[PDB]
């Protein structure tokens, strides 16, 4: 939909230009999902789906026959400061230098093309990784699974065994093929959808110590929680996709993220069986074309909700953030309009929620040309101060946080990124020189006694034919 | 010298192809030194000298006017597992996205061109960073300092203040311009050289709690430790460079590393005043041309000695290892001859410590063409198995570790790296596909009942015109 996107892009976690350099460290050049859990020993384990190496070019999933295709990979993090990104400090490798596949797959189309992780947790000293055996893919959003299964690790993710616990899908419509786990007290709640993205969500529950025991599961039936999987009724209507559920102590509610039709949405509840509050837009397909996934980071605190989001054309995973209040409502949205430049193919005049820029400028539009999506802004010349800017309404005497992604031609010598009055008077800014990789800059400032500021990035072009590219600019209120 | 190098290359820590991605994370594209100390809170702080960003090309230090020249930068590590590299998890930045200069300099040639860190230590809640103010550079190994100073931080390296504590260089020949600190019980020993690389080492000591109080220093005079700095006498003869001193519990000895003339060497002592055992070669200038630095990692144990080495042409820092026994003697040297390919401009026949390769092979030779140095091997073809190898003598029944750096054409689909019998039958190998970045591969294997093996790397070339490059190959006994 054309709905505004409240969420802010924090970091590209995988693939080309990722700070993590997963491409160079582990041959993780393109991948998806980024499913996260706390391992119980002060780390976050992150699992990924179909993953390609060095020869991948994009756009989209899939690579040449030498693309080192793995069905899944697994990395760790110790990073407790997500505002500045999420560093990966370990991966499961084999050989050393190459992140390996942890759950094997036959890679025979129409039998088992792949194995895709769906949700993870730890209990005591064991790690558990739900996954689906994919028989074949169909059109976007449509695919057939053989079963949901569970792998486990007793060494912190270093080695993995596939358990004998399965939800078979003989008729295709089994309602727990793609799971999402959340612990509350002694119970693990187990959300489930069918294979693909067109059906509803159901819910089951299991004592935390009995996750692998099918006989200990009980299924919400409308009235109570009973023994038979066939008694499960939906708790959230179609369409639902891959899901993530988190119990948020700030708001004292469960939070659920999924792609529902076109957009990633969030719903909230105080009971896992519902009622579930209506969808709130997290990210729209207009701003983030061909987005999917949406998994909560286990260390979310204080209503500052970080999550991973996937996108088809760059086929890589992004760390995102949004803010909730104590009722689970999204507040303090990105105040920049058309933050990822995807909504227009031209600049405007900088007013009424448009971008403007000095000659020569434009919106580059090509598969995966953006930091995210297919659009980015640029400016380029060989004389003088050359900038891109937007007028944003703000609250008098409030404090704001500006982030955005940029890179320059190698010969760039002096640019700036920041906020200024509508008359050009700087409020707060940083200074960059030459920027190779897509790089995030970050400026915090007081609005002062004004109700509008101009957010901007630019380069001096006195020294030569110099350019700057810009994407995914966010202005959010602080607190 | 032409002496063999026992030391093994572990990882490129900074710059192009570095796993750490310092270039993309922090605009650290080219740098030197990598001076390390324990911060007393579970981390390793690492400081660097003159640092350049995105527009740096090399070879050598120095960059175009837009090179984002900083006199020094600082990064952190929490990595306890040095065999597979040293991950940096934090940097002092300003603006965010750019590692900043922590000790300011005037950048006025012949007044103060730069400020260069020398040695570091923590006592209680405070970090200290010794530095030299450089008035002007001379020919290689020759420069003039104004003084040696000490900066400090009370917040784990986040913010720095330059202290009033100084060793002025009035007569040009002050013996403590370029320091190395080592702590033993309650005492810091402060080794010192004159400016540049052609004089001797002296030694002082101070109570660890009184590092900033000049009055508290005592200076080894040949009989005891006295109050006057002009009473200090040499404990190690010229020529001495930058130095690193560690107390090694394993061997119960002080270990000292320095460039001494052409080669980096190590000396050992049970007392800081000496006597110092004779120099042992660490790395030779023939294998590692224009090498410098050599700083011990503070978490070394068990006789596994990790250190940082600098090299002019690539102008970046590498992690290195050697092994010592309990007398501080270097053992289990790299058995591969001409590990870095620097000793010849052509291939040999694979015997008597030479390399061999299939058609079409060569030694590529240009400034900074190597992973390290100017030389790397290549093999390239469009049919069949295409490999580079060397016959290496081994001990029957012993276990070996093979590491080496390689990368391929994008179109590579199936290569191997390992050890095999002289008749070509693999003993232990790994399988790579397409390798973008210079990437280290690692194989451990048992020699069996054999007196020699062939270490190799190669690619299958049936799928197209495909090439592999190779450098810095090491075979070391395990344990
Ligand atoms: Ca975009
Ligand atoms: Ca070399
Ligand atoms: Na995928
Ligand atoms: Na972080
Ligand atoms: Na330097
Ligand atoms: Na490591």
Residue numbers in the entry:
A (entry chain A), B (entry chain D): 2 to 480
What did the article's authors report about this structure?
In this study, we identified four enzymes (two GH183 endo-d-arabinanases, GH172 exo-α-d-arabinofuranosidase, and GH116 exo-β-d-arabinofuranosidase) from Microbacterium arabinogalactanolyticum. These enzymes completely degraded the complex d-arabinan core structure of lipoarabinomannan and arabinogalactan in a concerted manner. Furthermore, through biochemical characterization using synthetic substrates and X-ray crystallography, we elucidated the mechanisms of substrate recognition and anomer-retaining hydrolysis for the α- and β-d-arabinofuranosidic bonds in both endo- and exo-mode reactions.
The crystal structures of EndoMA1 were determined at resolutions of 1.60 and 1.80 Å for the apo and ligand complex forms, respectively. We focused on the complex structure because the apo and complex structures are nearly identical (Cα root mean square deviation (RMSD) < 0.27 Å for all chain pairs). Therefore, we performed experiments of multi-angle static light scattering and refractive index combined with SEC (SEC-MALS/RI) and small-angle X-ray scattering combined with SEC (SEC-SAXS) on EndoMA1 to clarify its quaternary structure in solution. The molar mass estimates of monomeric EndoMA1 calculated by the amino acid sequence and measured by SDS-PAGE were 53,678 Da and 52.4 kDa, respectively, suggesting that EndoMA1 formed a dimer in solution. The experimental SAXS profile (black open circle) and theoretical SAXS profile calculated from the dimeric crystal structure (red line) were in good agreement. In the crystal structure, the active site cleft of the catalytic domain of EndoMA1 adopts the shape of a typical endo-type enzyme (right). A Dali structural search showed that the catalytic domain of EndoMA1 was similar to the hypothetical protein BACOVA_04882, N-acetylgalactosamine deacetylase, and GH43 α-l-Araf-ases. EndoMA1 and EndoMA2, two new GH family endo-d-arabinanases with signal sequences, depolymerize mycobacterial lipoarabinomannan and arabinogalactan extracellularly.
